[PDB]
Design a protein around this ligand. Structure first.
Ligand SMILES: O=C(O)[C@H]1CCCN1C(=O)Nc1cc(Cl)cc(Cl)c1-c1ccccc1
Length: 133
C-alpha cells in the first residue's frame, strides 16, 4: 500500500517554468518547443514491489519500472541515458537522474486531489500539475 495514493491515470493540466528547466537540463531548441506543447498522461501502477510509471503523449511514450531504492537505466523522453534511483521520502516519490556528471531531481507529491511534480536542475525549478484523468 506504499504508493496507493499515487496509483492511477493522471493528465497534465498546468506547467510553470518548464522551458527554463529543460534549458537548464540541456535540452535543445526543437525538442523544447515540441515537447513543451505536450499534455502527457502519467499512468502509475504497482504490482508487488514493482512500481511502473508510463508517460504517454503526442511527443513520446515512455515507461519505467523499478523497485524503490534500486538503481536502474532510463532513456528519458529527450534521449538522455541516465542512471535513476527512486525513493519514497516522507510520502514523496523522489526520482534522481544522473548522467554526464549532472543530476536532476523530480519529486511527485499528492496535494489535495492533484499530483504535483517538481523538477529541479541546479537553481531552476519547474512545477507540473496533474489531475485525475
Ligand atoms: O513531463 C513531465 O511532467 C515531467 C515530470 C515527470 C517526468 N517529466 C519529464 O521527464 N519531462 C521532461 C523532462 C525533460 Cl528535461 C525533457 C522533456 Cl522532453 C520532458 C517531457 C516533455 C513532454 C512529455 C514527456 C516528457
Amino acid at each position: 500500500h506504499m504508493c496507493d495514493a499515487f496509483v492511477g491515470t493522471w493528465k497534465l493540466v498546468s506547467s510553470e517554468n518548464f522551458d527554463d528547466y529543460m534549458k537548464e537540463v540541456g535540452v535543445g531548441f526543437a525538442t523544447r518547443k515540441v515537447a513543451g506543447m505536450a499534455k502527457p498522461n502519467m499512468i502509475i501502477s504497482v504490482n508487488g514491489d514493482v512500481i511502473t510509471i508510463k508517460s504517454e503523449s503526442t511527443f513520446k511514450n515512455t515507461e519505467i519500472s523499478f523497485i524503490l531504492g534500486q538503481e536502474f537505466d532510463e532513456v528519458t523522453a529527450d534521449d538522455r541515458k541516465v542512471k535513476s534511483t527512486i525513493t519514497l521520502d516522507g510520502g514523496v516519490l523522489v526520482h534522481v537522474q544522473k548522467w554526464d556528471g549532472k543530476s536532476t531531481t523530480i519529486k511527485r507529491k499528492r496535494e489535495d486531489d492533484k499530483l504535483v511534480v517538481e523538477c529541479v536542475m541546479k537553481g531552476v525549478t519547474s512545477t507540473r500539475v496533474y489531475e485525475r484523468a
